[PDB]
Design a binder for this molecule. Structure first.
Ligand SMILES: *[B-](O)(O)[C@@H](C)NC(=O)c1ccccc1C(C)C
Ligand SMILES: *[B-](O)(O)[C@@H](C)NC(=O)c1ccccc1C(C)C
Ligand SMILES: [Cl-]
Ligand SMILES: [Cl-]
Ligand SMILES: [Cl-]
Ligand SMILES: [Cl-]
Ligand SMILES: [Cl-]
Ligand SMILES: [Cl-]
Ligand SMILES: [Cl-]
Ligand SMILES: [Cl-]
Ligand SMILES: [Cl-]
Ligand SMILES: [Cl-]
Ligand SMILES: [Cl-]
Ligand SMILES: [Cl-]
Ligand SMILES: [Cl-]
Ligand SMILES: [Cl-]
Ligand SMILES: [Cl-]
Ligand SMILES: [Cl-]
Ligand SMILES: [Cl-]
Ligand SMILES: [Cl-]
Ligand SMILES: [Cl-]
Ligand SMILES: [Cl-]
Ligand SMILES: [Cl-]
Ligand SMILES: [Cl-]
Ligand SMILES: [Cl-]
Ligand SMILES: [Cl-]
Ligand SMILES: [Cl-]
Ligand SMILES: [Cl-]
Ligand SMILES: [Cl-]
Ligand code: NA
Ligand code: NA
Lengths: 471, 471
């Protein structure tokens, strides 16, 4: 008789009415499919044949049913059990007056990509859809650190105190770029752009990557993402990208693990009754962002949560478990256009926890669902995980890599002080300075007239007026 | 032998090393002083004599020591005990890196003024100062609802959607009126002014009361406040006012109790061994604000907490005790200039809880001490009180009194739509409208050129540009 086990060998089931069983069995079936096709010498060409494939999929299922295989999962019994109780006990906190709210969460070890526990949904007995591994939804503004800022930093095109335009601008189709009811403001730092999740700065950042011919697909495909069209202007805001929570957790794993991707996995090994290893996970680490980039981004995402602009999470957690709230939490929120998907992705140096909520039919949630409800539910989820496994989150801090370049830059421009051409006239740009972190060799450039990411001529005239005002 | 008892007759002590004992004994001694002086026929003139007074104070103390009196306090044993445990267990949450932080809290029944429990300090054994009844500190911005907005509303000079200037302006001594580093912004609603605790709108509101000769002292002295100089421009920001937490709790009691003051008290009765009532509390309710005013202010203070701009309290509480967080909480925060005193005053229809923190030597706290630390500690305190006495906060809602006048007003002006003189030119002021609540007879006036509370000529030019821009 075949068994699926937790990470410590405790049997989950013989080959039963929950996500854990069907998720791990589906994945073990897929690994058995690959093993049996390779064993029978069936080529990837032969496997293109629809009837041969159907047969091999059936053979795989039956082989587990009838064999005596042991399937070792990465799942930590105590932790995953605590996560189930947390959703059973506190899932109702998600209900925001837009009907029953669905949820998915994946908890992943940053150093291995192992999935220690997950939440598939509110209640498998009422709704079987698996929101952790099956349902794909736009990751909304949580795309910004990975595909816009992280890449721009990694390419030496931005530092931590770089200024970006948030002046009003339009998309290619002529529509204004919006952030709720705001058509935009003026210049702002990268930290302010992240903390608020403004949209225009991320639009400009990605425009810059396109203009510069940056291989964005290279980064994203190294983390396992599949995006059909990389020219989409709203990609940083989650346009043109749909992901599972387990996949997206893996992108935040990469940033938390100092830029080093490990592939997510729930199966570590499948053995025959006699011990023959028929499948084993093989770690293939990839340095997707430099250590400088990742560690700079960790410092920025720490402030996203502490600032409490887009999520109440740190307030909810400091109440529930003040000691755990003092662990080194970093994270990012997302909200889709009509409030159809809310995300909160969280990490400590040891673990990453992804969280989505939304409705199976894509109807809107309430305006506050992601800011407050999901934050409060995820604070309960994190507490429950720590209650189950007291050291699992860890007490380590994220810290800048030694390879980070520190540049003294003007607050106003985010570039080094120097002379600048303004309206036909050299001007000595002077004033108060801040340390800005870079991931290139030479750090920040000298200040130039177009000192910010993005902006029209009119925007710069308005901005320079204001700076020159200060000198 | 004389005994001090809790409200249900359970003996607190015979006439011992805590705030409860010394507070209730000091107050019983003062009531015994009045009783003995009156019994011995000593006139208030004779009582002016310093030696006669010293003798009567001693006689009072000894009379309790030696007599067999029963002193019934208002203190609820379970609740006050829970409050002591809360401070013992969670007072450390107040420590913000500016040294040990001291604290006072008073919990009061809104319908009676009875004090059900209080916190004197972190630990009587280490520091005896009584921060609930003895120490007087500026109430900072918590003065605003009572002495500026509440009065202006009560006088028919403002409604709930009235617009106030927050344009830069100076105090009489020429210094800018500040709100952290901001010299101000532009026009704003009363709700925005309250939620953020901006200072310039409260300065203008109180200026208007002065200009109009409003008897502000009348209101404040009806609630037991003692303020030496009512001409102080910064009175709404806590300048020129110092209060105990028990006194200040009583002003918020008045607003929560639909405008009806009841005097705070910790002693309800003192009897002789033979049953002779030597002192009994006599309730003297006073309608300090109309029911319309108070109920309008409750709606505004509800949004102060929900908006989470100046306090994380509702996030801390919704995590700890989601059901209790759904009770009808209203409140206001305060912070003195150098971050020397932080306040959070909270009410449900049944109870009011005042909370101060600061340092005994008036050194600064951290910038976030009142926003986060005191909010998290008070969320724990409120939870502990509900755990001890499950119905004590109640599930009632605050609601507008029927006598409230509802006016349809322009969002831009907070006054009714109509023709206005702009730069020599009649203009039809049109646009979107909101319901505004008033406490007078006729509701809001028609829009006038100076539509807001306060503002210079230049401010109105800038404001009207912008409104006329919209039509
Ligand atoms: B991102 O999800 O923060 C970003 C693209 N979201 C929005 O612009 C958005 C969509 C609907 C409601 C609110 C918001 C922002 C987060 C205010
Ligand atoms: B009131 O206490 O909110 C108001 C008068 N406080 C301040 O202006 C102040 C003083 C020091 C630090 C911050 C602040 C405000 C609350 C930002
Ligand atoms: Cl499943
Ligand atoms: Cl499960
Ligand atoms: Cl076979
Ligand atoms: Cl395990
Ligand atoms: Cl669009
Ligand atoms: Cl690309
Ligand atoms: Cl993907
Ligand atoms: Cl492309
Ligand atoms: Cl797997
Ligand atoms: Cl075998
Ligand atoms: Cl590197
Ligand atoms: Cl924080
Ligand atoms: Cl918050
Ligand atoms: Cl649905
Ligand atoms: Cl005392
Ligand atoms: Cl006590
Ligand atoms: Cl006597
Ligand atoms: Cl009692
Ligand atoms: Cl001043
Ligand atoms: Cl007066
Ligand atoms: Cl007073
Ligand atoms: Cl006066
Ligand atoms: Cl009393
Ligand atoms: Cl007697
Ligand atoms: Cl009345
Ligand atoms: Cl709320
Ligand atoms: Cl001190
Ligand atoms: Na967001
Ligand atoms: Na305040």
């Amino acid at each position: 008789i075949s068994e699926i086990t937790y990470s410590d060998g405790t049997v989950i089931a013989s080959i039963s009415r929950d996500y854990l069983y069907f998720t791990t069995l589906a994945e073990a079936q897929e690994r058995m499919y690959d093993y049996l096709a390779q064993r029978d010498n069936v080529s990837a060409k032969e496997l293109k044949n629809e009837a041969t494939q159907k047969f091999y999929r059936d053979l795989a299922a039956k082989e587990i049913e009838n064999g005596g295989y042991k399937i070792t999962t990465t799942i930590d019994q105590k932790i995953h059990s605590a996560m189930q109780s947390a959703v059973a006990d506190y899932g109702y906190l998600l209900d925001d007056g837009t009907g029953r709210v669905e949820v998915g969460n994946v908890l992943m070890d940053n150093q291995t990509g192992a999935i220690l526990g997950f939440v598939g949904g509110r209640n498998y007995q009422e709704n079987q859809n698996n929101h952790a591994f099956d349902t794909k939804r736009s990751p909304a503004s949580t795309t910004k650190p990975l595909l816009a800022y992280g890449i721009a930093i990694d390419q030496g095109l931005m530092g931590s105190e770089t200024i970006l335009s948030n002046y009003p601008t339009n998309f290619a189709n002529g529509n204004p770029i919006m952030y709720a009811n705001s058509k935009g403001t003026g210049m702002m730092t990268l930290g302010e752009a992240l903390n608020y999740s403004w949209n225009i700065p991320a639009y400009w950042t990605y425009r810059m990557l396109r203009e510069n011919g940056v291989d964005v697909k290279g980064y994203m495909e190294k983390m396992g993402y599949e995006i059909p069209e990389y020219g989409i202007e709203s990609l940083p805001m989650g346009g043109g990208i749909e992901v599972t929570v387990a996949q997206h957790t893996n992108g935040y794993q990469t940033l938390a693990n100092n830029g080093v991707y490990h592939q997510k996995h729930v199966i570590s090994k499948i053995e025959a009754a006699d011990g023959r290893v028929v499948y084993e996970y093989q770690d293939k680490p990839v340095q997707v962002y430099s250590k400088a980039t990742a560690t700079i981004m960790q410092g920025l995402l720490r402030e996203v949560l502490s600032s409490r602009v887009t999520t109440t999470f740190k307030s909810n957690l400091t109440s529930l478990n003040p000691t755990l709230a003092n662990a080194d939490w970093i994270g990012k929120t997302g909200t889709t256009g009509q409030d159809e998907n809310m995300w909160l992705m969280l990490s400590t140096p040891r673990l990453t926890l992804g969280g989505w909520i939304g409705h199976d039919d894509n109807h809107s949630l309430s305006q506050q669902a992601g800011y407050s409800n999901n934050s409060n539910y995820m604070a309960h989820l994190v507490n429950a995980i720590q209650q189950a496994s007291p050291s699992i989150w860890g007490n380590e801090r994220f810290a800048l890599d030694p390879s980070v370049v520190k540049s003294e830059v003007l607050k106003s421009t985010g570039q080094k002080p120097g002379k600048v051409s303004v309206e036909g006239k050299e001007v000595e740009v002077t004033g108060s300075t801040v340390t800005s972190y870079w991931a290139n060799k030479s750090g920040a450039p000298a200040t130039s007239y177009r000192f910010a990411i993005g902006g029209s001529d009119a925007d710069y005239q308005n901005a320079w007026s204001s700076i020159v005002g200060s000198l």
